[PDB]
Design an enzyme around this catalytic site. Structure first.
Site, PDB file in Angstrom:
ATOM      1  N   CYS A   1      45.780  51.566  14.730  1.00 44.94           N
ATOM      2  CA  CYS A   1      46.760  51.570  13.652  1.00 44.94           C
ATOM      3  C   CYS A   1      47.166  50.133  13.357  1.00 44.94           C
ATOM      4  CB  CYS A   1      47.985  52.406  14.022  1.00 44.94           C
ATOM      5  SG  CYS A   1      49.041  52.809  12.613  1.00 44.94           S
TER       6      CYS A   1
ATOM      7  N   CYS B  96      50.880  49.311  13.124  1.00 45.11           N
ATOM      8  CA  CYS B  96      51.485  49.330  14.448  1.00 45.11           C
ATOM      9  C   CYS B  96      51.291  48.030  15.215  1.00 45.11           C
ATOM     10  CB  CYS B  96      50.907  50.490  15.260  1.00 45.11           C
ATOM     11  SG  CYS B  96      50.973  52.086  14.410  1.00 45.11           S
ATOM     12  N   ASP B  97      50.133  47.384  15.076  1.00 46.54           N
ATOM     13  CA  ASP B  97      49.829  46.160  15.807  1.00 46.54           C
ATOM     14  C   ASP B  97      49.562  44.970  14.893  1.00 46.54           C
ATOM     15  OD1 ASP B  97      49.982  47.975  17.859  1.00 46.54           O
ATOM     16  OD2 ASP B  97      48.081  47.419  18.795  1.00 46.54           O
TER      17      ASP B  97
HETATM   18  C1  LIG Z   1      45.501  52.617  19.372  1.00 45.26           C
HETATM   19  C2  LIG Z   1      46.551  53.501  18.711  1.00 45.26           C
HETATM   20  C3  LIG Z   1      47.714  52.736  18.706  1.00 45.26           C
HETATM   21  C4  LIG Z   1      48.892  53.253  18.161  1.00 45.26           C
HETATM   22  N1  LIG Z   1      50.129  52.420  18.164  1.00 45.26           N
HETATM   23  C5  LIG Z   1      51.357  52.946  17.605  1.00 45.26           C
HETATM   24  C6  LIG Z   1      52.608  52.093  17.612  1.00 45.26           C
HETATM   25  O1  LIG Z   1      52.582  51.003  18.071  1.00 45.26           O
HETATM   26  N2  LIG Z   1      53.844  52.616  17.045  1.00 45.26           N
HETATM   27  C7  LIG Z   1      53.862  53.986  16.469  1.00 45.26           C
HETATM   28  O2  LIG Z   1      54.866  54.413  16.009  1.00 45.26           O
HETATM   29  N3  LIG Z   1      52.628  54.808  16.470  1.00 45.26           N
HETATM   30  C8  LIG Z   1      51.381  54.282  17.032  1.00 45.26           C
HETATM   31  N4  LIG Z   1      50.177  55.099  17.034  1.00 45.26           N
HETATM   32  C9  LIG Z   1      50.217  56.442  16.464  1.00 45.26           C
HETATM   33  C10 LIG Z   1      50.157  57.500  17.575  1.00 45.26           C
HETATM   34  O3  LIG Z   1      49.099  58.379  17.322  1.00 45.26           O
HETATM   35  C11 LIG Z   1      51.463  58.283  17.672  1.00 45.26           C
HETATM   36  O4  LIG Z   1      51.569  58.820  18.957  1.00 45.26           O
HETATM   37  C12 LIG Z   1      51.458  59.440  16.677  1.00 45.26           C
HETATM   38  O5  LIG Z   1      51.799  58.982  15.405  1.00 45.26           O
HETATM   39  C13 LIG Z   1      52.493  60.463  17.142  1.00 45.26           C
HETATM   40  O6  LIG Z   1      51.971  61.202  18.214  1.00 45.26           O
HETATM   41  P1  LIG Z   1      51.956  62.851  18.091  1.00 45.26           P
HETATM   42  O7  LIG Z   1      53.368  63.350  17.899  1.00 45.26           O
HETATM   43  O8  LIG Z   1      51.107  63.263  16.907  1.00 45.26           O
HETATM   44  O9  LIG Z   1      51.335  63.491  19.481  1.00 45.26           O
HETATM   45  P2  LIG Z   1      50.379  62.660  20.540  1.00 45.26           P
HETATM   46  O10 LIG Z   1      51.049  61.357  20.909  1.00 45.26           O
HETATM   47  O11 LIG Z   1      49.033  62.372  19.919  1.00 45.26           O
HETATM   48  O12 LIG Z   1      50.196  63.582  21.895  1.00 45.26           O
HETATM   49  C14 LIG Z   1      48.917  64.029  22.243  1.00 45.26           C
HETATM   50  C15 LIG Z   1      49.016  64.911  23.517  1.00 45.26           C
HETATM   51  O13 LIG Z   1      48.622  66.136  23.245  1.00 45.26           O
HETATM   52  C16 LIG Z   1      48.167  66.721  24.452  1.00 45.26           C
HETATM   53  N5  LIG Z   1      47.313  67.856  24.191  1.00 45.26           N
HETATM   54  C17 LIG Z   1      46.300  67.931  23.325  1.00 45.26           C
HETATM   55  N6  LIG Z   1      45.769  69.157  23.400  1.00 45.26           N
HETATM   56  C18 LIG Z   1      46.467  69.829  24.324  1.00 45.26           C
HETATM   57  C19 LIG Z   1      46.397  71.099  24.829  1.00 45.26           C
HETATM   58  N7  LIG Z   1      45.420  72.073  24.397  1.00 45.26           N
HETATM   59  N8  LIG Z   1      47.187  71.595  25.756  1.00 45.26           N
HETATM   60  C20 LIG Z   1      48.143  70.771  26.240  1.00 45.26           C
HETATM   61  N9  LIG Z   1      48.252  69.499  25.769  1.00 45.26           N
HETATM   62  C21 LIG Z   1      47.415  69.036  24.814  1.00 45.26           C
HETATM   63  C22 LIG Z   1      47.352  65.618  25.127  1.00 45.26           C
HETATM   64  O14 LIG Z   1      47.475  65.691  26.615  1.00 45.26           O
HETATM   65  C23 LIG Z   1      48.057  64.360  24.592  1.00 45.26           C
HETATM   66  O15 LIG Z   1      48.750  63.748  25.582  1.00 45.26           O
HETATM   67  C24 LIG Z   1      48.909  54.549  17.616  1.00 45.26           C
HETATM   68  C25 LIG Z   1      47.732  55.306  17.624  1.00 45.26           C
HETATM   69  C26 LIG Z   1      46.559  54.794  18.170  1.00 45.26           C
HETATM   70  C27 LIG Z   1      45.238  55.564  18.219  1.00 45.26           C
END
Ligand SMILES: Cc1cc2nc3c(=O)[nH]c(=O)nc-3n(C[C@H](O)[C@H](O)[C@H](O)COP(=O)(O)OP(=O)(O)OC[C@H]3O[C@@H](n4cnc5c(N)ncnc54)[C@H](O)[C@@H]3O)c2cc1C
Ligand SMILES: Cc1cc2nc3c(=O)[nH]c(=O)nc-3n(C[C@H](O)[C@H](O)[C@H](O)COP(=O)(O)OP(=O)(O)OC[C@H]3O[C@@H](n4cnc5c(N)ncnc54)[C@H](O)[C@@H]3O)c2cc1C
Ligand SMILES: NC(=O)c1ccc[n+]([C@@H]2O[C@H](COP(=O)([O-])OP(=O)(O)OC[C@H]3O[C@@H](n4cnc5c(N)ncnc54)[C@H](OP(=O)(O)O)[C@@H]3O)[C@@H](O)[C@H]2O)c1
Ligand SMILES: NC(=O)c1ccc[n+]([C@@H]2O[C@H](COP(=O)([O-])OP(=O)(O)OC[C@H]3O[C@@H](n4cnc5c(N)ncnc54)[C@H](OP(=O)(O)O)[C@@H]3O)[C@@H](O)[C@H]2O)c1
Lengths: 321, 317
Positions: A142, A145-146
């Site tokens: 993202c 984000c960075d």
């Molecule tokens: C390299 C990278 C860097 C990022 N840096 C930032 C930043 O600096 N600031 C910011 O605000 N956002 C950042 N993001 C965005 C990041 O994806 C945020 O976490 C997202 O916007 C919000 O997360 P979420 O609520 O969608 O759930 P997620 O954070 O994606 O949680 C996923 C979880 O779901 C669980 N899961 C999946 N399937 C199952 C299942 N069947 N049963 C039980 N558990 C399961 C997994 O164990 C996993 O831990 C970054 C993303 C990436 C890829």
């Protein structure tokens, strides 16, 4: 447990915020933070998060998710570190099994009157050599984000073909000295508008038919990525170039495989809910945080998780007699 | 003066400003010396802070974060705005003459002026505010100072009944004081209310005086209510009071230039911050009515920030 009031799936920020609100409401929510298919929120891989409100000096994503988990557990959220295998959104109580405990004759691991979804939509990683070494030490997914990290200011920035690449590259152009876009195949998948305003943007070049072979850099504690061996794929021409930052932009993979049509999805895979809410294609089950593909942020995911918790409580009020 | 995108309001507004200044723009944030979490004593409902954080401290942290990332935070009220021209004109309070010059115009504009819950200005309200009194029950419900204790709520709309049915999950007895003989709420909401076991409804009754511990950090203990028909005042044991009347959204500066709903809130394309007028965005409690939460407010502010970044990028190319 054997039969709970509400079950939240996922370790993400949305799941923990929803669990905070639901355990505050004395609703006794269970939370499945899984054993990625990361441990804890998918935000934990980020070394430091500075774009979250309330932390003027930044905050590590690992300890931030740890604090959200501590909040949920303090409020009464029964969090169990188990992955969900299968769901049965057919019976009036929603039944869910556990990975390695699934079975057509096996009893469900947990049933609940409602289920919140925050399984996350982690951006795909190339699993490149050196990626596991310089992960979030120069390699991210993202740009919003960075992008403002000082280690990328006035430095060559490389991005690996969808529009998700240009939307971040034309933004990174506000920092690095020279942004370059590596396309797996000639031309741009994105619509003509972003390509038109991108090739005409002066601070970004687009090297077609070029993919990064490996990610070179330092070799010290918290070593930064310094260079990138990229390979033009029409001549097999490998070449190592200066690249302080590498940004993954391959399409995000939302964890919507559990629904498999029980809840209805979109073409990209994400879960479709009503705009500005968490009401999925089916009552009782709400998805939050999976929910967004345009912003892909943790603060928005936390807000949508609060939304999911509030609507979950609102629904439980109607189901009870 | 002139800036990239102007953000009106003091959490979502700070979040929008953080995201704008992080993207290296010129975002002027207007706290105003003007016309809400700082009123909250302690906040446990916010994520990442398991041990809780004071609303004033949280907003101060957000403010220093925003000014660190590069927002021209100006403590001046925005009075009138002229959204007719392609660049958006704004005017400072007491500096908003018809012939006066715009203070800090901009190309795009974010709105996060909040939606403040109406207060009653009761005697002792200022003395016992947030030490027993509040306006959001989902925010101050599970506070240990209210659990298994008498709770009184003032309101007549559906929000009052929802807050009472939420508070019945902690206090020993929840009481609601309708100012008139009947309920302004819907029939289903009122049915679920009167059927809710722990709630008690008293019509034609308004809270007249909040009387708690005048200790240096005192709480709230009792409430002098009055039957508005007879005028017979009566002081009852009220451990926790909750304003649940309608909320005033501070959109007055828009004044129909952007489409508004009946309750006053700024309408938005659902799931976004877009307003009726293409170019101006609204976020936080101005566009949020069903949640009124600070975390959802900051989420909507981030939405507005990202969409304004996209809009200002699509404008100049
Ligand atoms: C390299 C990278 C860097 C990022 N840096 C930032 C930043 O600096 N600031 C910011 O605000 N956002 C950042 N993001 C965005 C990041 O994806 C945020 O976490 C997202 O916007 C919000 O997360 P979420 O609520 O969608 O759930 P997620 O954070 O994606 O949680 C996923 C979880 O779901 C669980 N899961 C999946 N399937 C199952 C299942 N069947 N049963 C039980 N558990 C399961 C997994 O164990 C996993 O831990 C970054 C993303 C990436 C890829
Ligand atoms: C007692 C009470 C307790 C609460 N507790 C919690 C809690 O525990 N957890 C939680 O998440 N939420 C809580 N909330 C919700 C709280 O209101 C949030 O802060 C709100 O959801 C955020 O609103 P906002 O971000 O849209 O705007 P806000 O930041 O809340 O307010 C907007 C600001 O805009 C300023 N303004 C208005 N006009 C102008 C102008 N012309 N020029 C410059 N500035 C202007 C006003 O001074 C105002 O302060 C509570 C609310 C109340 C009343
Ligand atoms: O639009 P969207 O991004 O949201 O979804 P998307 O269509 O999945 O975008 C994926 C883009 O990334 C490219 N891609 C896929 N795998 C790659 C890999 N290992 N290395 C480098 N590039 C890869 C693809 O090249 P192609 O153009 O060849 O598909 C495609 O252009
Ligand atoms: O959102 P929403 O559901 O709240 O819709 P809403 O129509 O804004 O409901 C607001 C409620 O506040 C009540 N109210 C206004 N002033 C009051 C006062 N001094 N004392 C007690 N109650 C007062 C009103 O009672 P009334 O029904 O008497 O107007 C009204 O029902």
């Amino acid at each position: 447990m054997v039969h709970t009031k509400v079950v939240i799936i996922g370790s993400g920020p949305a799941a923990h915020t929803a669990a905070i609100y639901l355990s505050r409401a004395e609703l006794k929510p269970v939370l499945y933070e899984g054993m990625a298919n990361a441990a804890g929120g998918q935000l934990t891989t980020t070394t430091d998060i500075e774009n979250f409100p309330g932390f003027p000096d930044g905050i590590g994503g690992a300890e931030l998710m740890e604090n959200m988990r501590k909040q949920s557990i303090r409020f009464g959220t029964e969090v169990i570190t188990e992955t969900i295998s299968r769901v049965d959104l057919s019976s009036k109580p929603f039944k869910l099994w556990t990975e390695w405990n699934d079975g057509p004759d096996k009893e469900p691991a947990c049933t609940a009157d409602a289920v919140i979804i925050a399984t996350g939509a982690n951006a795909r990683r190339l699993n490149l050599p050196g990626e596991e070494t310089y992960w979030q030490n120069g390699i991210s997914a993202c740009a919003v984000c960075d992008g403002a990290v000082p280690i990328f200011r006035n430095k060559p920035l490389y991005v690996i073909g969808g529009d998700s690449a240009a939307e971040e590259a034309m933004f990174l152009a506000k920092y690095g000295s020279s942004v370059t876009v590596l396309v797996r195949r000639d031309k741009l998948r994105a619509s003509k508008a972003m390509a038109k305003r991108l090739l005409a943007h002066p601070k970004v070049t687009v090297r077609f038919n070029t993919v990064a072979t490996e990610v070179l850099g330092e070799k010290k504690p918290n070593g930064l990525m310094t260079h990138l061996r990229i390979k033009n794929t029409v001549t097999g021409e490998e070449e190592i170039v200066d690249a302080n930052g590498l940004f993954y932009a391959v399409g995000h993979d939302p964890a919507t495989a559990l629904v498999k049509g029980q809840i209805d999805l979109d073409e990209d895979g994400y879960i479709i809910t009503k705009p500005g809410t968490s009401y999925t294609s089916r009552e009782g089950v709400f998805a939050c945080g999976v929910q967004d593909k345009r912003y892909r942020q943790a603060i928005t995911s936390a807000g949508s998780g609060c939304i999911a918790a509030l609507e979950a409580e609102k629904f439980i009020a109607e189901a009870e007699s």
